Design a protein around this ligand. Sequence first.
Ligand SMILES: O=C(O)c1ccc(-c2cc(F)cc(F)c2)cc1
Ligand SMILES: O=C(O)c1ccc(-c2cc(F)cc(F)c2)cc1
Lengths: 115, 108, 115, 108
Amino acid sequence: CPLMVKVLDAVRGSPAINVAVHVFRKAADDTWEPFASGKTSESGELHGLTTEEEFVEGIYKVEIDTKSYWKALGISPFHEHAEVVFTANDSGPRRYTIAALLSPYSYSTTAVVTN
Amino acid sequence: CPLMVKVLDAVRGSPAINVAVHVFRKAADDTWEPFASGKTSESGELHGLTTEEEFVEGIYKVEIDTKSYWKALGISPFHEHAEVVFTARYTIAALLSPYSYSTTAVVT
Amino acid sequence: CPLMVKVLDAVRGSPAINVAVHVFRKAADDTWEPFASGKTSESGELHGLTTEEEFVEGIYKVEIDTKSYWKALGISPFHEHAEVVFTANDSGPRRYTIAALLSPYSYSTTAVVTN
Amino acid sequence: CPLMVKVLDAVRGSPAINVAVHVFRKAADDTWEPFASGKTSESGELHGLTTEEEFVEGIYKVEIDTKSYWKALGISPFHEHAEVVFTARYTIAALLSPYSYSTTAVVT
Ligand SMILES: O=C(O)c1ccc(-c2cc(F)cc(F)c2)cc1
Ligand SMILES: O=C(O)c1ccc(-c2cc(F)cc(F)c2)cc1
């Protein structure tokens, strides 16, 4: 249950559906290694990215493919993607929700971290 | 200027121009009385609302007519307007989308 | 299920718990009439404000008592409250989620409206 | 100026001052090469990053070191930094909180 991504659309007032998300974890040599990926559901949520055992301490990047999302609607957006980079699990296991709110020339993101 | 409003459009990536803004001060009977108003400029800014002399401590409401703004672009928006209510340099900034806005105060 | 409010805290990375919310509906004479109220739960959600039958077409104001929230933490915030004013159900019944993200000198809000 | 960055602090309601900002351009082999950098001023602004001559079409990354900013205020923040990636007047604005940020592009 440890990592979840939620994406909303501020233009349509809806979940952002079928948004591709890629998660990377920084490796020893400081390269970004592929960690997990998926697509948001009809409710704009992405679950089952990882397990408690696999989501170890480290620096993670969640890249939300906002450009493919807007291009799929028809709209030539500003950003290539929205990145969320963070250290995770560095004082033990936490549950992380990464939420993003998308517009063609703006996005926000926030984290909810619980124990 | 003691009070400035700045309005940006999050969809087009542009200042939000010609947006109506009305400011009210809270009266003793808890009603809102008109204080100042204007339209945003080509840079999405509204200055000249008040002077330091008039802008005393009080509760103020800044109402931004986001609904007319979006309608004129052909978009049905969600909010009737965007209201920012605070007690009192103040900059009230607003970033608009059809179903969302944000607002921040830069008090310098 | 027709009206829900979700509030997050951007300072703590947590749901905003025990935030008071008052909902008003504009009356014939253009006064704001009390409609519903409650407090956000431990997950920062507020459900059971109204029923499909009672939530008729109209203009509604959802006032989120952000100042009492921050004052309860210790922080003297900028805003008195966050207001969300909107016309509801004017092309039939919709389900409305009103979400807000709070910081002492800033908030955002977004609507998710589904059918 | 073709490119300006502006950074605001959503908690204190202030410009975010002395924030490090680094800009990278995407190279042909898909790597990020350094382009320009600076610290935000007392108004939370960074100008002088580039000239029109140098700022050609390309994919750019603006990295804002939000983590050092928050740490210096005694706050453990969530993000390592805030990255804004786009293809190319550009203003990149960022509004910061410890567990949240937003960003917008005002292209005028
Ligand atoms: O919370 C937001 O979405 C947000 C709100 C306002 C701004 C912003 C505020 C300013 F005063 C100037 C600017 F360029 C951008 C940037 C982001
Ligand atoms: O800063 C914002 O605009 C913003 C970003 C995300 C959310 C949000 C996050 C969630 F996990 C759920 C929700 F309903 C809304 C609400 C507002």
